[model samples]
Every structure is written in structure tokens, then in C-alpha cells.
Target: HMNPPPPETSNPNKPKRQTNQLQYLLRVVLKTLWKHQFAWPFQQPVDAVKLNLPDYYKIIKTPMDMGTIKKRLENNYYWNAQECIQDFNTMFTNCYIYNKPGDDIVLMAEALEKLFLQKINELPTE
Candidate 1:
């Protein structure tokens, strides 16, 4: 008896579905984060000179921002959805490392992180 390739279709389809689902969720999460009121500090890369935080350069090795993250997504520079998601994590991590406790920026960053998680969980998966 000849096999009819029952597993061929859905096997490859699994990864494709997973990747597409991840990308869609990332886009939706990013859009919601950008619109969040607490998103201002993370909108752009930190300016070590203008902001007078010379020490920031030494503290933060790889700088990340929502604007840059969105641009890279538009340009298709990221290798996977996790990369984009990690960038957002890095942005908030940087804020926490640079700002002190009880700082407004840190407070906003925490709030924005919660909103990010909410949007991520709300998206549907295939």
C-alpha cells in the first residue's frame, strides 16, 4: 500500500503557523506599547550628551528604543520575533539600570511593561 503523505502538509505548516502567530503578536504588542502614556522615555534612544548622562554610555552597551524597534521591524532587520521582543526588554532594562529608585521614569517603565504583557497575552494564536 502506498502512503498518501498525511503528515507532510501539517508538519511543515506547524512552524510556519508558529512563526506567523509570533510575528502578528509582536506587531500588536508593539503598537499598543507605542500608544501607551508611559512610553515617552522609551520612544527614542538615550542621548548621552544632550541629556548630560555621560555615564550612561558606559552603563548601557546596546541601546534600544521603541522607535528603533519599530523601524527595524519595518525594514525587516530582525531574525525572529524573539529578537524584537528582546529589544523591548532591553529598553526597559536600560531604564531600570540608568534611573534610580523612586524615579518617575522607572515608575512609568514598570507600568508600560505591564501594559506590554497585557497586550501580548490578549493576542490570538494559531
Candidate 2:
């Protein structure tokens, strides 16, 4: 006669768990990029470091802040996840216009997008 089996209790911490998993995935992907020298899609070895920093600085006004991302990841700053994702997309779009991207680059880009936007649904109708 007591409480009829407390109706389906949901895990209150599920969201936090998902968030942690997403952060882990992001960190792994970023590490992979570094391990591969961030030279995806370029069959030939391209020296990004050697490139004129000022030129790119002026060209892409809002470049991906890898420095910040790295720092955040190091400190477990998951709050900036959306900002990092946006920067990745922006850099990917602008960088390709001037530099020819390779297949691997494309593959990584798709993977990143899928992982980042996995929660988004269809756009709103006009």
C-alpha cells in the first residue's frame, strides 16, 4: 500500500555527464590535430608557423584562438566550449579560401562539425 514504485526517476546528473563526455571528445580531437601537426588536407608539408603572421593576422581579423583554447582545455574550462567550436568553424572556412585543403582535412572538419552540432535540430521555418 506504500508509494507505488517512485515513478521513473531521471538521473539529475545526466546532463553533467554528457557535458563531460563532450568535453573529453573535444580535447581528444584537438590533441589529434596537434599530433598530426595540424596539417590535414595538405598532402605536401606546409609550414604554417613560417607563414607571415602579420599577413594572416590582418586577413582573418578573427582567427581561431588556439592559444586560449589550449589554456582552457588545460584548466578544464568547459564553459568556453561554444566559443571554441565557433572559432574552429570560422578558421576552417577562412583558411581554406587561401590554402588548398586535403581530404584528411575535410574528414576532420566533418567530424568536428558532427560532434559540435550533434544537438542542433532543423532550422526554424520562415
The global C-alpha lDDT for each of the candidates, from Candidate 1 onward, is 0.70, 0.45
Q: lDDT by residue for model 1 over 1-126, one digit each (tens)?
A: 221221111222223223664566446887788888888778777766667777886777777888777766655555567666787788889889988878999989999888877766665654
Instruction: Give candidate 1 regions above 4 Å deviation.
Output: 1-19, 22-26, 123-126
Model 2, position 42, has a per-residue lDDT of 28
lDDT of 2 by residue, 45-88 (tens): 22344643435444544444344444445545444445456655
* lDDT: worst 10-residue window of model 2: 1-10
Per-prediction tally of clashes: 0, 2
In candidate 1, position 104 carries an lDDT of 92
Cα error, candidate 1, residue 53 (Å): 0.9
**C-alpha positional error of residue 87 in candidate 2 after TM-score superposition, expressed in Å:** 2.2
TM-score of each: 0.75, 0.45
TM-score of 1: 0.75
